Amino acid sequence: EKPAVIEERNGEIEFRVVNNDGERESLIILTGLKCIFQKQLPKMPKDYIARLVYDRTHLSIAIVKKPLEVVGGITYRPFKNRKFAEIVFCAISSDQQVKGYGAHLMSHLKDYVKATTNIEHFLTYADNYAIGYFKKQGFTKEITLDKSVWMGYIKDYEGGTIMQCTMIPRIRYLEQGRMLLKQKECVQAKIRAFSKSHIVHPPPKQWRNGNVTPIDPLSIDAIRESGWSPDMDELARQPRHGPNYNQLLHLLNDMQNHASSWPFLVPVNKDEVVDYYDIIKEPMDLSTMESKLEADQYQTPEDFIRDAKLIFDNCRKYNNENTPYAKSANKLEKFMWQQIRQIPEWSHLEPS
Amino acid sequence: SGEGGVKYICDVCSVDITSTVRIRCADPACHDYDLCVPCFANGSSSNAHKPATHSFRVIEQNSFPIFDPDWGADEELLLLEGAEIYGLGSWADIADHIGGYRTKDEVRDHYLKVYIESPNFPLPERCSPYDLELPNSISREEFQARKKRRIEERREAAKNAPPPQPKTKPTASIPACHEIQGYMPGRLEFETEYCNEAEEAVQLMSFDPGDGINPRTGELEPEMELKLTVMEIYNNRLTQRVERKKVIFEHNLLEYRENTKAEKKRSREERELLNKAKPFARMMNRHDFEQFCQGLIDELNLRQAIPPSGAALLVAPELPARYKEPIIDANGFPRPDAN
Amino acid sequence: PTVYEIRPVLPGMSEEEIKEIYSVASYPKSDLAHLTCGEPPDRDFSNSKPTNQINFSTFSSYIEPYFRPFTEEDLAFLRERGDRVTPFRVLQARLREQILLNGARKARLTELVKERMAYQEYQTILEDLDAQVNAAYLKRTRTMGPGIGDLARTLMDRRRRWIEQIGAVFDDEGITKCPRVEDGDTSIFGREIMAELIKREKEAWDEEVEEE
Numbered sequence: 001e002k003p004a005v006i007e008e009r010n011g012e013i014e015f016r017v018v019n020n021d022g023e024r025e026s027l028i029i030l031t032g033l034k035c036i037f038q039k040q041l042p043k044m045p046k047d048y049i050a051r052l053v054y055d056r057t058h059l060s061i062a063i064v065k066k067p068l069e070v071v072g073g074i075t076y077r078p079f080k081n082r083k084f085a086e087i088v089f090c091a092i093s094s095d096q097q098v099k100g101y102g103a104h105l106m107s108h109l110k111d112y113v114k115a116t117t118n119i120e121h122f123l124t125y126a127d128n129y130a131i132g133y134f135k136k137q138g139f140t141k142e143i144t145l146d147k148s149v150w151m152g153y154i155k156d157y158e159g160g161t162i163m164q165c166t167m168i169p170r171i172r173y174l175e176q177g178r179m180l181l182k183q184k185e186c187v188q189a190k191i192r193a194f195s196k197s198h199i200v201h202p203p204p205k206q207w208r209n210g211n212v213t214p215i216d217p218l219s220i221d222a223i224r225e226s227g228w229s230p231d232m233d234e235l236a237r238q239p240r241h242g243p244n245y246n247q248l249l250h251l252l253n254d255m256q257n258h259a260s261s262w263p264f265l266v267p268v269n270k271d272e273v274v275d276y277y278d279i280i281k282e283p284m285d286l287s288t289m290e291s292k293l294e295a296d297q298y299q300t301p302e303d304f305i306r307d308a309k310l311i312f313d314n315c316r317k318y319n320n321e322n323t324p325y326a327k328s329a330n331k332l333e334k335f336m337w338q339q340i341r342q343i344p345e346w347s348h349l350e351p352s
Numbered sequence: 353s354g355e356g357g358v359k360y361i362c363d364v365c366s367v368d369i370t371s372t373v374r375i376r377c378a379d380p381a382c383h384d385y386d387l388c389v390p391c392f393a394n395g396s397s398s399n400a401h402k403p404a405t406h407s408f409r410v411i412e413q414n415s416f417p418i419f420d421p422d423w424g425a426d427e428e429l430l431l432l433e434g435a436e437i438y439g440l441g442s443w444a445d446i447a448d449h450i451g452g453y454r455t456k457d458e459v460r461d462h463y464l465k466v467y468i469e470s471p472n473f474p475l476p477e478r479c480s481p482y483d484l485e486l487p488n489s490i491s492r493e494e495f496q497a498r499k500k501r502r503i504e505e506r507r508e509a510a511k512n513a514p515p516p517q518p519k520t521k522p523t524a525s526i527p528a529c530h531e532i533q534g535y536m537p538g539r540l541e542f543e544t545e546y547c548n549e550a551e552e553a554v555q556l557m558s559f560d561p562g563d564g565i566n567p568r569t570g571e572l573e574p575e576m577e578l579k580l581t582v583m584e585i586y587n588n589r590l591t592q593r594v595e596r597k598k599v600i601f602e603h604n605l606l607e608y609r610e611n612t613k614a615e616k617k618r619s620r621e622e623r624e625l626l627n628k629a630k631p632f633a634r635m636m637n638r639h640d641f642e643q644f645c646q647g648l649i650d651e652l653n654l655r656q657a658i659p660p661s662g663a664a665l666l667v668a669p670e671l672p673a674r675y676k677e678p679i680i681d682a683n684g685f686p687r688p689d690a691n
Numbered sequence: 692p693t694v695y696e697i698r699p700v701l702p703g704m705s706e707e708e709i710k711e712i713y714s715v716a717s718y719p720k721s722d723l724a725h726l727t728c729g730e731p732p733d734r735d736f737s738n739s740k741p742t743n744q745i746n747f748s749t750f751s752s753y754i755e756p757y758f759r760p761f762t763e764e765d766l767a768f769l770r771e772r773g774d775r776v777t778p779f780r781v782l783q784a785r786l787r788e789q790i791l792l793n794g795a796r797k798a799r800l801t802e803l804v805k806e807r808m809a810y811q812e813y814q815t816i817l818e819d820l821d822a823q824v825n826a827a828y829l830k831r832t833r834t835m836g837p838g839i840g841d842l843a844r845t846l847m848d849r850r851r852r853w854i855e856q857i858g859a860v861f862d863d864e865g866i867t868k869c870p871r872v873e874d875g876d877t878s879i880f881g882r883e884i885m886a887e888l889i890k891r892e893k894e895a896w897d898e899e900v901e902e903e
Contacts, residue, residue, distance in 0.1 A: 015716060024564060116713065137441075171697075200378050201409065203404060212395035213395070222410050553825050557832075635879070
């Protein structure tokens with residue numbers, strides 16, 4: 001039980017679902033939520049946040065302290081007929097972020113919507129630093145909804161990254177801990193019901209005389225019953241992804257997080273510009289290289305370096321050097337070279 | 353590394369042994385001294401390990417079905433561990449962690465069936481650990497051969513698989529779909545409302561924490577009442593906007609082309625009369641408005657009479673069908689289809 | 692030991708068990724859904740958007756004529772019946788038949804417009820006090836202060852008096868609403884009253900003819 005749970009049980013904190021009805025308490029709660037959201041999202045105008053929070057269709061779930069102080073909250077607009085609700089904001093005061101309230105609040109929201117209505121899907125536009133939190137809370141970057149269900153209904157937010165989540169029916173998301181722990185306990189007991197590792201076997205009969213010679217594991221009775229084969233032994237040591245998957249994933253996350261990679265986050269549309277495809281015969285963006293890496297097509301790091309260099313070259317080719325596009329592309333090339341130089345292995349691949 | 357797991361490395365060959373059958377030295381002289389099957393096969397000893405007179409233990413990889421004929425113990429444990437770490441609902445990473453080339457859809461279906469949607473409750477399987485038919489229904493060798501075959505086939509397919517198509521630009525909802533730039537018919541909201549500046553007075557408002565009532569008088573403190581009073585005006589503004597939208601929805605004021613075409617086909621005097629009569633539409637409903645206008649036009653056309661126009665239709669050799677019956681009957685009550 | 696699933700709600704249940712079900716320890720009382728303009732039509736919007744829009748200036752100017760405040764200028768449009776001597780067989784009967792209905796409708800519209808104008812004259816004075824009390828608070832934020840000013844204390848009392856006393860007259864709900872077809876027989880031209888309007892207008896016509 002994380003500190004949020006004990007604090008809630010002891011009455012230190014408390015949650016409240018509030019909409020702009022016109023009471024006294026509701027207005028305090030809504031204004032505090034507006035203050036928090038305005039603090040955390042400085043880029044957007046304060047007018048737009050003020051309009052969205054104080055609307056008459058949206059809801060809000062907030063966490064309040066005993067002397068009526070609000071720490072954070074989430075805002076959403078349910079589409080009851082379309083079986084999906086949109087999340088529009090999310091934030092917690094930075095001073096109190098260390099406690100770890102985010103998952104607890106998300107569980108409260110999911111449970112409430114599940115038990116009060118019949119929605120299934122959540123659609124959101126995540127910020128560029130909340131992606132880890134959203135992923136840890138069950139969302140995914142791949143969308144599995146038809147283009148008719150959620151087109152024209154949600155509102156685009158520039159600089160975002162749409163995500164999805166499909167709630168699993170008939171579960172109590174607040175008690176995940178104990179339920180999953182018991183499920184693990186019972187599967188582990190089932191496993192321990194057979195595992196012969198509790199049997200302390202004598203030295204192999206070939207080595208009982210003091211001579212050590214190779215022994216085929218399939219010869220032994222216990223191992224034989226274990227069904228060990230050379231094939232599985234050799235296969236179990238091959239990771240699903242490429243060996244550098246963790247390091248390239250770290251680099252990809254750093255590059256995406258960097259505020260110098262915005263123009264490449266998504267490709268350029270054919271409708272908006274026609275000459276982009278006609279001039280560039282190898283249009284490459286970040287999503288394309290990520291997918292190709294997921295396909296294992298990139299055999300060597302040189303492929304990734306060439307892809308980045310070609311992306312930069314295309315950016316400079318389609319957009320003039322004087323224009324900010326090419327200058328930003330060169331700055332991002334410098335940033336990637338910095339990241340690589342931080343890696344000794346790839347430091348020697350920089351041309352002179 | 354973001355993963356919270358523990359990596360196990362053999363003490364002799366320094367080869368990962370976590371996901372493989374292994375053997376450990378059980379003598380108290382050796383602590384956490386793990387020897388892989390090859391090392392224990394070739395018998396390469398190090399430190400205080402004695403393969404001659406010390407009893408050993410065989411760590412089994414526990415490969416056989418328990419719940420699902422296509423899934424073994426290791427796969428299920430990895431699934432639940434991923435649920436603990438990667439969060440229950442994150443199917444992509446948990447599928448990646450389980451391995452075996454199970455696409456996210458397959459892992460989701462397997463979990464739903466086995467645990468969530470099942471003839472079962474959070475106590476797994478039929479009755480107890482005493483039910484041991486599935487383990488002795490297939491020999492482990494056959495199951496492992498099936499796993500090897502499926503893995504090799506899947507690897508070959510992936511190597512021969514076609515390249516994944518590049519992601520297109522994300523399908524921006526662009527709620528401007530209506531034929532009025534900046535109209536969001538999916539939300540029934542405009543972008544530039546009646547008093548879009550109304551929020552200019554409450555976008556900086558802040559409340560004193562933990563306040564709301566006077567500790568002494570029991571009444572709202574002057575600042576609190578003043579602050580509350582400035583939001584009642586905002587609520588009234590919102591309600592005015594809502595009434596505006598309700599009125600505009602009716603009467604079909606969103607069909608620019610049709611209404612303009614209809615006015616264009618109309619003559620001068622009829623256009624002027626309809627323009628004059630426009631304002632009262634707020635107080636009637638569509639049918640009443642149509643009756644009112646059509647009555648005015650009928651009166652004007654009859655006065656004039658006393659493609660072809662109405663004045664040219666009334667003076668036709670054959671009278672139209674709707675003019676052979678009194679509009680209001682003898683007992684003073686107008687006919688229902690007055691206009 | 693503890694329940695692992697969600698317990699479905701039932702109508703007419705106790706508040707404490709409602710919180711138990713929700714676990715959130717509170718909830719809004721009124722859904723406020725009745726103020727929604729209407730549920731979304733539930734269509735398929737993936738169809739290609741039109742590529743030629745019309746500027747908001749044009750649309751605003753196009754709908755502006757439908758909401759201008761009422762004035763005595765248009766209170767004279769109705770209250771006018773036109774010429775009734777020169778036109779006066781079938782067409783003459785038709786015209787005599789239709790003039791009376793026209794007059795009845797116009798009379799009813801006159802009966803409504805007066806209360807509408809009174810409400811307008813009320814709102815134009817309420818809005819001034821609303822604006823003054825709103826602006827007398829922005830200065831506090833600007834200077835960030837101290838006690839509330841006497842002006843800010845006495846404007847609230849004036850506003851509250853004005854509302855609670857005068858606005859009682861306009862309590863009727865129909866002073867701000869447009870009747871809707873979906874509700875049913877909401878037409879403001881019920882025969883039960885149109886009959887008497889018709890008879891009164893005929894009496895007035897006969898009196899005018901006698902004078903003329």
